[PDB]
Amino acid sequence: NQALLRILKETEFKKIKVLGSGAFGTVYKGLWIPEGEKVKIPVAIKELREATSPKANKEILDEAYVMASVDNPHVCRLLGICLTSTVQLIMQLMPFGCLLDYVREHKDNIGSQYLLNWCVQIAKGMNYLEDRRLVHRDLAARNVLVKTPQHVKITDFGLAKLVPIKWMALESILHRIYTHQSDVWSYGVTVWELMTFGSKPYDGIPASEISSILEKGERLPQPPICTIDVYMIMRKCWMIDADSRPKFRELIIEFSKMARDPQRYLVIQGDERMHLPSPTDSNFYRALMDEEDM
């Protein structure tokens, strides 16, 4: 339990490059230098923006042990923490970045088989989080990391009382209710990000006005490459009654069915001439970057 979260000394790692910033911190590419060793191992470091107090560190530590205990091929694990004045958090570095930036930069080379398989994998990780009784609260394409193009992992979940309005279920906006079923709403938006190759949802609509447009029944529009079979799934994720939305276990089955005939369900120009994963190219990736079970 507590051996899954490594407490690091300031001196055994170094921030070398800024990767980005979000709501609660700045993420750096870093190097871990093990004590007494000569190697430098790349890591990702998130330094929190606000300074905390030794008793606030007790709250952080309690949740951090939980996030270090996940064990699933499609869920990132928190690896370590350094309790400086501003707390720093360490996880595995993903050289491919987040899935949002990935679908934007490769939006002219991504076939339906990849897109559908990413949907399957994100649903697998969320179903695991539900089994562990962990609500994500901030599912979005930026919080799905690409370990390899064939293997994505959910990250930055579990942050309970520590706002991404345009990804949140109506009841989360109005009442601060976060459940596994509002994660299903955020899943639909995340899929919409992938199918639009990374468009901003509700572009140009002020966040303070989103719950008004949701209450009047407007939802994100049908992405051009999405058939209606895919679009109904996304829309069912945005039902006002949370208990009527699909469950993650069901979303696994439906997108796995569609992934077995991906060109029937996504309509992409050039899809027949698009890279798909050969066993040779997959064996190479896993041996170089991705040795974990799946």
Ligand X SMILES: O=C(Nc1nccs1)[C@@H](c1cc(F)ccc1O)N1Cc2ccc(-c3ccc(N4CCNCC4)cc3)cc2C1=O
Interaction between residue 143 and Mg ion (CB under 5 A)? yes
If the CB atoms of residues 38 and 161 are measured against ligand X, the closer one turns out to be: 161
Q: Which of 133, 161, 216, 273 binds ligand X (CB under 6 A)?
A: 161
CB of 136 to ligand ANP, least distance (A): 10
Helix H or strand E encompassing 211? helix 210-215
If the CB atoms of residues 47 and 156 are measured against Mg ion, the closer one turns out to be: 156
Interaction between residue 42 and ligand ANP (CB under 6 A)? no
Q: Rounded to 10 degrees, what is the CA torsion of 128, 195, 197, 71?
A: 10
CA distance 28 to 39: 19
If the CB atoms of residues 78 and 135 are measured against a second copy, the closer one turns out to be: 78
Q: Which of 33, 83, 159, 274 binds ligand X (CB under 6 A)?
A: 159
Q: Which of 4, 19, 31, 242 binds ligand ANP (CB under 6 A)?
A: 19
User: What is residue 196's DSSP assignment?
Assistant: T
Interaction between residue 78 and ligand X (CB under 6 A)? yes
What are residue 91's DSSP bridge partners? Answer: 44
CA 104, distance to chain mean position in Å, is 15
Instruction: Burial-class residue 15 by CB neighbours within 10 Å (0-12, 13-18, 19+).
Output: middle
By a kind-dependent CB cut-off of 5 to 8 A, residue 27 interacts, out of Mg ion, ligand ANP, a second copy, none, with ligand ANP
Interaction between residue 156 and Mg ion (CB under 5 A)? yes
Q: How many residues bind ligand X (CB under 6 A)?
A: 25
Binding mask 112-151 for ligand X (x = CB under 6 A): ----------------------------------------
Instruction: Burial-class residue 247 by CB neighbours within 10 Å (0-12, 13-18, 19+).
Output: middle
Interaction between residue 207 and ligand ANP (CB under 6 A)? no
CA distance 232 to 216: 19
Interaction between residue 190 and Mg ion (CB under 5 A)? no
Q: Which of 81, 87, 90, 98 binds ligand ANP (CB under 6 A)?
A: 98
Using alpha carbons, select from 287, 62, 274 the residue that is nearest to residue 161.
Answer: 62
CB of 236 to ligand ANP, least distance (A): 24
If the CB atoms of residues 56 and 174 are measured against ligand X, the closer one turns out to be: 56
Instruction: Burial-class residue 201 by CB neighbours within 10 Å (0-12, 13-18, 19+).
Output: buried
List gaps in the chain by the residue before each (C–N > 2.5 Å). 162
CB of 265 to ligand ANP, least distance (A): 28
